[PDB]
Design a protein around this ligand. Structure first.
Ligand SMILES: NC(=O)C1=CN([C@@H]2O[C@H](COP(=O)(O)OP(=O)(O)OC[C@H]3O[C@@H](n4cnc5c(N)ncnc54)[C@H](OP(=O)(O)O)[C@@H]3O)[C@@H](O)[C@H]2O)C=CC1
Ligand SMILES: NC(=O)C1=CN([C@@H]2O[C@H](COP(=O)(O)OP(=O)(O)OC[C@H]3O[C@@H](n4cnc5c(N)ncnc54)[C@H](OP(=O)(O)O)[C@@H]3O)[C@@H](O)[C@H]2O)C=CC1
Ligand SMILES: NC(=O)C1=CN([C@@H]2O[C@H](COP(=O)(O)OP(=O)(O)OC[C@H]3O[C@@H](n4cnc5c(N)ncnc54)[C@H](OP(=O)(O)O)[C@@H]3O)[C@@H](O)[C@H]2O)C=CC1
Ligand SMILES: NC(=O)C1=CN([C@@H]2O[C@H](COP(=O)(O)OP(=O)(O)OC[C@H]3O[C@@H](n4cnc5c(N)ncnc54)[C@H](OP(=O)(O)O)[C@@H]3O)[C@@H](O)[C@H]2O)C=CC1
Ligand SMILES: CCc1nc(N)nc(N)c1C#CCc1cc(-c2ccc(C(=O)O)cc2)ccc1OC
Ligand SMILES: CCc1nc(N)nc(N)c1C#CCc1cc(-c2ccc(C(=O)O)cc2)ccc1OC
Ligand SMILES: CCc1nc(N)nc(N)c1C#CCc1cc(-c2ccc(C(=O)O)cc2)ccc1OC
Ligand SMILES: CCc1nc(N)nc(N)c1C#CCc1cc(-c2ccc(C(=O)O)cc2)ccc1OC
Lengths: 159, 159, 159, 159
């Protein structure tokens, strides 16, 4: 099973200037609970954007995709291709517009957080993958972040 | 398949003052059995620690990590990076607190010997890596050494 | 008795870019009629959106909800929690999509103005709370303002 | 009208370790049909034990009892006393041994699901209230669950 997990603004924006352009502790919680105890796969830019304190992410097998000869990622496994990255029976892809796009054909689950903020796409943004009719989903109830953000969870699957 | 194999006191101590701080022939025999005929990888200080009589370890392809590029290890292969070292399909990492920690993300097997002795950690000790919940393990029965060391075997795996 | 009072487009939009996206003096008169001489509760953003001319709103006890421990609201009562805000026996919760959603469980009345204008929801809009079957309603007759927009009043109650 | 609704093993056990110690979808459907569109009242521990996706329970006015003035229950009404909680003309008390025991004197209906499983009481279990002879009752016919659980419904009343 390969799953994708991401958080997006309604626009589809997931990253900008090497960071996630909102703060949502509830989503961090959600992400940790899905991914804990499992192999996680991320592109190297996502690895760079991890806060130093949680790089590598604790309690997970961190796998970092890089097309660069000897990229160094202390505490993670660096691999050079998707075939090498996607071999664990429960794999969560967490990381990168580029790596979402490339790994999606291998995926049978998506766990999506939608954040209800106005955030129009800009050139160079990292974007969420667009899901087609092969997928079926369930939509969760809208909620308010205990800070103020409105957000909701989606769970998609295909067989 | 990259595997780790080590022997630790209950405390996690695997090395002190450049040597293993206990005597256990049965563990030596277990180590020999697992590693014979395979590629073994060790850090440079583990190489220095090998008794001269078995440096390099016979019947194994000895691979030594150093970032001293011109380092000389007669009878072994010296490499300067982890990716250079971990390319044999059955690889056993045998050697070093540091190299265990750095190689662990690449590993899907751990073969552990626990030695039931009181040996509290001291600053500068080499330590065994701590395994998180990505692993499943089987615990062997306690037994006594050729003399009276109580010891156990563990086998850990993840996929 | 806690009540909510709001005006929405048919779409459910009540605010955009910090302002109410329509002009309707008849609604303003309805609002003052209902709230005059009572305690009103609003979120900080709604307080900020009040025209300076009527901030605080005259003839009502203005209560403002803020998570900012030090927030200043001259002429209003700043409180840090919902419990502290909803203590008056007749309380009218006035704007704020956030504060509407959070106060709704405490409420037994809703006084709603619906504005018949095409105004599709956009990301980050403030939205009216959606009312479930715990509520009973009464619908008022459609009418035109001297403006040019159709509106009508709803009155909702539960015990 | 205050009613109690609960599901119990034959032994009286309704909760253990923060959860209901069985799965019975048919009971969930039964609970939903009785409580939908009404006020529901629950102790704080029952609130915590709700699956996050149905917290608060949809289509019902959720009321949570806590001896904490501070306590926060997003999407629910937190109250500090029984008198504050039981003021709706149709109230269903849904939760927890201690709120069952405390609210029972206010109640004139009980809707009970009995689950035919061997589940002896353990210290600290949450238990169903004991019904004395003030009540009259009707017993439903035994049914097998779609999973294979044997359960039946009881309806109790007093005036
Ligand atoms: N909101 C969310 O849920 C998340 C948001 N983000 C945001 O996403 C942004 C980063 O996404 P992005 O910029 O697209 O970069 P990625 O994080 O996707 O990593 C991209 C890099 O991974 C390497 N890579 C990708 N695919 C392969 C492959 N198939 N084989 C080998 N190497 C590969 C590439 O190397 P080369 O360039 O050599 O091809 C590329 O440089 C950041 O802003 C981050 O904060 C990150 C994670 C989740
Ligand atoms: N009980 C057991 O099962 C075992 C115990 N031991 C004990 O462990 C101790 C050795 O532990 P340690 O001191 O950690 O020995 P090491 O694993 O540290 O050998 C370390 C060497 O590997 C090279 N190296 C340094 N940084 C990196 C890097 N970032 N990536 C790759 N290679 C690198 C360097 O060689 P250079 O310095 O030349 O650059 C470094 O000094 C000894 O006391 C030994 O007896 C050893 C094996 C098993
Ligand atoms: N059409 C209508 O009927 C009305 C429409 N509106 C529109 O609504 C929009 C603003 O609504 P919205 O954006 O939802 O923000 P709100 O007006 O609901 O106020 C939100 C703020 O309330 C504060 N707060 C403190 N504690 C709490 C708490 N426990 N629960 C909730 N809020 C708390 C925070 O302020 P801090 O950040 O200081 O902590 C938070 O940012 C504006 O566009 C306004 O014009 C406004 C009024 C009526
Ligand atoms: N099988 C079934 O039908 C059901 C089973 N359950 C199970 O029941 C168990 C929980 O029941 P229980 O442990 O008895 O806890 P409760 O759910 O009864 O809630 C107890 C809490 O309610 C608050 N409370 C109780 N009495 C008062 C009062 N008089 N005034 C103010 N606050 C009050 C306190 O909250 P604070 O501590 O914040 O002061 C107290 O800790 C769980 O295992 C749950 O899964 C729950 C519902 C139905
Ligand atoms: C929490 C963000 C997130 N949400 C969802 N739904 N899917 C994702 N794939 C990511 C992601 C990511 C990368 C990332 C992780 C984290 C992070 C920090 C701590 C923990 C944890 O303690 O478990 C997890 C993720 C922080 C920042 C960050 O990018 C800047
Ligand atoms: C036997 C020690 C050991 N046990 C386990 N379970 N895992 C390990 N990785 C090592 C190790 C090591 C390094 C080392 C090997 C040996 C050794 C000696 C003989 C043989 C052999 O005959 O095969 C193998 C290793 C001796 C000393 C020594 O450190 C000082
Ligand atoms: C009159 C708008 C309104 N209608 C209903 N039915 N329910 C509400 N809760 C609000 C409201 C509100 C907050 C608010 C009041 C006003 C307002 C402004 C001016 C005057 C006045 O000058 O008379 C009165 C109210 C303006 C903006 C505004 O949010 C942006
Ligand atoms: C179905 C459980 C139940 N049965 C009966 N006969 N009486 C009760 N009071 C409760 C209860 C309760 C709390 C609770 C509700 C639910 C639940 C989930 C969904 C729905 C729904 O969709 O309506 C309702 C209750 C799930 C778990 C749970 O405790 C762990």
């Amino acid at each position: 099973m390969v799953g994708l997990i991401w958080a997006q603004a309604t626009s589809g924006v997931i990253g900008r200037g090497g960071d996630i352009p909102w703060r949502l502790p509830e989503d961090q919680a959600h992400f940790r609970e899905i991914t804990m105890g499992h192999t996680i796969v991320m592109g190297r830019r996502t690895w760079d954007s991890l806060p130093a304190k949680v790089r590598p992410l604790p309690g997970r097998r961190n796998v970092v995709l890089s097309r660069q000869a000897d990229f160094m990622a202390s505490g993670a496994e660096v691999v050079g291709s998707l075939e090498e990255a996607l071999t664990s029976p429960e794999t969560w892809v967490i990381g990168g517009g580029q790596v979402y796009a490339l790994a999606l054909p291998y995926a049978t689950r998506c766990e999506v957080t939608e954040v209800d903020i106005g955030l129009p796409r800009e050139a160079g943004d990292a974007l969420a993958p667009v899901l087609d009719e092969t997928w079926r989903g369930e939509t969760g109830e809208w909620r308010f972040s205990r800070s103020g953000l409105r957000y909701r969870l989606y769970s998609y699957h295909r067989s």
